[PDB]
Amino acid sequence: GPFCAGVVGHAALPATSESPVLDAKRSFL
Amino acid sequence: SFPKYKPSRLATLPATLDPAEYDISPETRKAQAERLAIRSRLKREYLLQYNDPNRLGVIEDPAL
Amino acid sequence: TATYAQALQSVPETQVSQLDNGLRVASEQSSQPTCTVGVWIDAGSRYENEKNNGAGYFVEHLAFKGTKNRPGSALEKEVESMGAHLNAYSTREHTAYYIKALSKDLPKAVELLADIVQNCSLEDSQIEKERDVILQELQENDSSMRDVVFDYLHATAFQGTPLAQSVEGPSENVRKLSRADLTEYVSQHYKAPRMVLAAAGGVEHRQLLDLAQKHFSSLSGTYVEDAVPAFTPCRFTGSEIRHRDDALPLAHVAIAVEGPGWANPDNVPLQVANAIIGHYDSTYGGGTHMSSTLASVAATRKLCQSFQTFNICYAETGLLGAHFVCDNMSIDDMMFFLQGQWMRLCTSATESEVVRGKNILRNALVSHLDGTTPVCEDIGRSLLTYGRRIPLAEWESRIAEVDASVVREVCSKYFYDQCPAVAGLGPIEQLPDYNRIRSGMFWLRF
Amino acid sequence: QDLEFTRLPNGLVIASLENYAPASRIGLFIKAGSRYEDSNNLGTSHLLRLASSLTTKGASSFKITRGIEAVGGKLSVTSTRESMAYTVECLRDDIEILMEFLLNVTAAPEFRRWEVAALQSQLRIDKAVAFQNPQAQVLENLHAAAYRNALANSLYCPDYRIGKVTPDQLHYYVQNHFTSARMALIGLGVSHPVLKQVAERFLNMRGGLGLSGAKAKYRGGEIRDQNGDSLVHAALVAESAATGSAEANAFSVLQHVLGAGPHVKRGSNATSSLYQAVAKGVHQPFDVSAFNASYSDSGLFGIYTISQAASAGDVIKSAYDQVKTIAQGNLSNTDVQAAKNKLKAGYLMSVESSEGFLDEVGSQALVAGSYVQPSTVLQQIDSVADADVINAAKKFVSGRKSMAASGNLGHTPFVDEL
């Protein structure tokens, strides 16, 4: 789960990508 | 789109034109079953007293 | 040198077939080696009464937690061992379980889907565990402001109607739910005529149909004791619900008006109109130069962190409006500009912005239907709602028919002099009183 | 049709696949990012990513924004530590206009002083939005602690440099790092000759390799944030193989063996070995996954854990012990096979979508030049043996480790203790 910290955008969408970073079942637990 | 039938106090809405007759739920069917059970129990008691060869007199109806 | 029209013509066509029990098997075939096969069920909170509200969410929670054929760990082990991803989503109108998996693994995926849909254990210990989890998740969902404000919008807009109920349901129902209620919910709402088996990607329609006949055939559409749930139209009530919590950093406001159903043709012009209104977030790079007048003014004055326009459609009613997060002292200005844009579209829309809205809608339609998961989702939802998967060519024709006159007509019908439904959260004191909001819905000049 | 790869004399790589789809996606992948920033110009990559809509020589900011919006197109900038990707997506009919806009943005930026000064606040806004999820800051600190050089640079501008990024620095970065040998123009739904024509039209200038960044050097440090959050995010990693190496595939298989991401929603991650190993010890809300980052020079592999502040030590220790058990040889062939299947399926699912396919083609073109078919990638995955996975685990256990932790951190272990 890279969880690329995407930013909502139109006509300019800055997206930055990191590497697998978990945060998989935190909501579940 | 025929003109609709406005129910009134002296002209009740027909069951056929009942907006609720076509919106049925499991609980509504359960309630109908319960009402049928009540009516069946009452009819059973009345008929038991009514067909008794020993009974002589009125069958006192508590409702009356 | 394929053209847009030619590309639409070359799109693979969805083939719909129906099992005798009533399950509809639909497939779109592509050369991709990965396929997404899912079962879409026409069950949701709108079909739930007060006491059993949230049972759908409970069933969704524990559906992957075990079957009679394979225990709780077994299903997960099979899914992960074949590399598949199993996911479910529950909405007020639809419930779905879909498996992302390799094309060669289609038979096993279909088996698992059938087991989940039909032979669900609903074991009591797992029921208690999921009860605890769901209560915790309700407490977590309280934090998500957007979800809360949309739930408030549904509650106030469709008050007294089943649509007002949340998908998760009240906590009291969650703790009071029992195995009998979940089993009854499954028996009543999970029926073959109300289910669609959809697939996308490397799936052969004949193979999918044969697998469906093998596994889903037992499922039946008969209702026990002829207790048939009956669909109920939901009344739209213009109302305002304000949860004033000044501690919250930013204010969320969602304002909407009653919208068309899924099958109503006016959805397309309304989507064009909403695209004209547009969407803005503080992170957008376009800023002031963005075409949307509301977005441009918001960027110039830093009125709102984010604002987006939504067109939520249900079977017979829908919520048409926008949701904007803004500072405590900028709510009134943003509401004024949003209503001004609504009235401008209603009264004096122009051809150029209509062309922009149509192009944006075309791009959204084509971009969304990319990948096996969205394509399968669209297939299932289209079969459940439209009764047919509207082909992209038909969407393009309907978009092309839209003109400035059409946009003005539909916007005047749905947006002008219509009582709106408003939900506010946070420091919403500056949010105008409902009389002012309703007054803004019409122009004294027009 | 099939993907067509052409290496132009200037060094640019042009790729095109005519999918005959309603939408066409064109992406220019440039071998620039946080890695190629020096200490003086830190954060310039961030503002460059934000400054995709500023006035160019060909077109003004107004024209770019309005035209891209009018055709319904989208202009997106995706930045990694080693890569920056500029992509335009729209209907195939209007792809030429967005292609002109894209090359104007990439090849002839003006960086006028007033526009950069106005955009400098978007640096802080973006940084705050990205740092809302703790994972972003934890990974930034993890990269900073692991490497003492290029790879340590953050994907987001440092706070002291928010208002200090100068237009001259942006021009220098573009001139020295946006070069033809470093660029690859990838197109989906666009014919190869048209892409070639546009590449000659705009990307002819600024040829050559450009400035070269220094090799990343492992630092083996720790950064502990102490932000007071309830849950503690802790990542413990050790140096691994560079991308496109045999040991890199071994490390990927090891990541899938330990557990990378849940496949069943609200599941128990039964296949994931770390998850169960921690779960038996800790009954509190917890999370654990394997962190596999591969870059051209080097890579990092390790464990990422999210747990209650009090129980962070137990979770980290249990995950580390499970990796140690894998290293000692307690690895079954069935687990290796299941992980291989999961990885192959993940690769296929990633390349399924248009965005994923474009990103994969661009990454392969920049890193390795040529495009490798999915079948060959799957064959590489299959070639990995269990012994390779065991050796990767042994390398992670034995190698010097870098750790980043955020949260209460009262009981979070230090690297020496682990």
TrEMBL record, chain A:
Q: Where does this polypeptide localize?
A: Membrane
Q: Which domain of life is it from?
A: Eukaryota
Which family does the UniProt entry place this protein in? Belongs to the Rieske iron-sulfur protein family.
Q: Output this protein's name.
A: Ubiquinol-cytochrome c reductase, Rieske iron-sulfur polypeptide 1
Gene name?
Answer: UQCRFS1
- Shown portion of the complete protein runs from 47 to 75 of 299
TrEMBL record, chain B:
UniProt entry keywords in alphabetical sequence: Electron transport, Membrane, Mitochondrion, Mitochondrion inner membrane, Respiratory chain, Transmembrane, Transmembrane helix, Transport
Secretion signal, residue range per the UniProt entry:
none
Keyword Hydrolase in the entry? The reply is no
Enumerate the subcellular locations listed in this protein's record, separating them with semicolons.
Mitochondrion inner membrane
The record's GO CC annotations read: mitochondrial inner membrane; nucleoplasm; respiratory chain complex I
Q: Tell me where on the tree of life, at the top rank, the source sits.
A: Eukaryota
- First-listed, main subcellular location of the protein, grouped into a coarse class: mitochondrion
Q: Does the keyword Mitochondrion apply?
A: yes
Give the similarity note: Belongs to the complex I NDUFB4 subunit family.
Q: What does this protein do?
A: Accessory subunit of the mitochondrial membrane respiratory chain NADH dehydrogenase (Complex I), that is believed not to be involved in catalysis. Complex I functions in the transfer of electrons from NADH to the respiratory chain. The immediate electron acceptor for the enzyme is believed to be ubiquinone.
The UniProt subunit note reads as follows: Complex I is composed of 45 different subunits.
Report the protein name in the record. Answer: NADH dehydrogenase [ubiquinone] 1 beta subcomplex subunit 4
Lineage here is: Eukaryota, Metazoa, Chordata, Craniata, Vertebrata
Task: Please state the gene responsible for encoding this protein.
Answer: NDUFB4
UniProtKB/TrEMBL annotation, chain C:
An example molecular function term from Gene Ontology annotations:
metal ion binding
**SUPFAM superfamilies reported in the protein's UniProt record:** LuxS/MPP-like metallohydrolase
Q: Which domain of life is it from?
A: Eukaryota
Principal location listed in the UniProt entry: mitochondrion
User: Which Pfam families does the UniProt entry name for this protein?
Assistant: Peptidase_M16 (PF00675), Peptidase_M16_C (PF05193)
> Membrane topology for this entry?
Peripheral membrane protein
Q: Which UniProt keywords apply?
A: Acetylation, Electron transport, Membrane, Mitochondrion, Mitochondrion inner membrane, Phosphoprotein, Respiratory chain, Transit peptide, Transport
Q: Which GO cellular component does the record give, naming just one?
A: protein-containing complex
Q: Does the keyword Repressor apply?
A: no
> Where is this protein found?
Mitochondrion inner membrane
Question: Start and end of every Peptidase M16 C-terminal domain?
Answer: 176-361
Ranges where the Peptidase M16 N-terminal domain occurs: 24-170
| Quaternary context | Component of the ubiquinol-cytochrome c oxidoreductase (cytochrome b-c1 complex, complex III, CIII), a multisubunit enzyme composed of 11 subunits. The complex is composed of 3 respiratory subunits cytochrome b, cytochrome c1 and Rieske protein UQCRFS1, 2 core protein subunits UQCRC1/QCR1 and UQCRC2/QCR2, and 6 low-molecular weight protein subunits UQCRH/QCR6, UQCRB/QCR7, UQCRQ/QCR8, UQCR10/QCR9, UQCR11/QCR10 and subunit 9, the cleavage product of Rieske protein UQCRFS1.
Q: Which family does it belong to?
A: Belongs to the peptidase M16 family. UQCRC1/QCR1 subfamily.
Q: What is this protein called?
A: Cytochrome b-c1 complex subunit 1, mitochondrial
Q: Which organism is it from?
A: Sus scrofa
Automatic annotation (TrEMBL), chain D:
- Gene Ontology CC terms, in alphabetical order: mitochondrial inner membrane; mitochondrion; nucleoplasm; respiratory chain complex III
Subcellular localization is given as: Mitochondrion inner membrane
UniProt keyword annotations, A-Z: Acetylation, Electron transport, Membrane, Mitochondrion, Mitochondrion inner membrane, Respiratory chain, Transit peptide, Transport
How is this protein situated with respect to the membrane? Peripheral membrane protein
Q: Name one GO molecular function term.
A: metal ion binding
- Report the record's Gene Ontology biological process terms: proteolysis
Pfam families noted in UniProt = Peptidase_M16, Peptidase_M16_C
Domain Peptidase M16 C-terminal span(s) in chain numbering: 164-343
Q: Per the database record, which ranges form the Peptidase M16 N-terminal domain?
A: 14-159
> Does the entry feature the keyword Ligase, yes or no?
no
InterPro entries given in the database record: Metalloenz_LuxS/M16, MPP/UQCRC_Complex, Pept_M16_N, Pept_M16_Zn_BS, Peptidase_M16_C
Please list which residues make up the signal peptide.
none
Family indicated by similarity: Belongs to the peptidase M16 family. UQCRC2/QCR2 subfamily.
Q: Which PANTHER family match?
A: CYTOCHROME B-C1 COMPLEX SUBUNIT 2, MITOCHONDRIAL (PTHR11851:SF226), METALLOPROTEASE (PTHR11851)
Q: Quaternary form? A: Component of the ubiquinol-cytochrome c oxidoreductase (cytochrome b-c1 complex, complex III, CIII), a multisubunit enzyme composed of 11 subunits. The complex is composed of 3 respiratory subunits cytochrome b, cytochrome c1 and Rieske protein UQCRFS1, 2 core protein subunits UQCRC1/QCR1 and UQCRC2/QCR2, and 6 low-molecular weight protein subunits UQCRH/QCR6, UQCRB/QCR7, UQCRQ/QCR8, UQCR10/QCR9, UQCR11/QCR10 and subunit 9, the cleavage product of Rieske protein UQCRFS1.
Q: What name has this protein been given in UniProt?
A: Cytochrome b-c1 complex subunit 2, mitochondrial
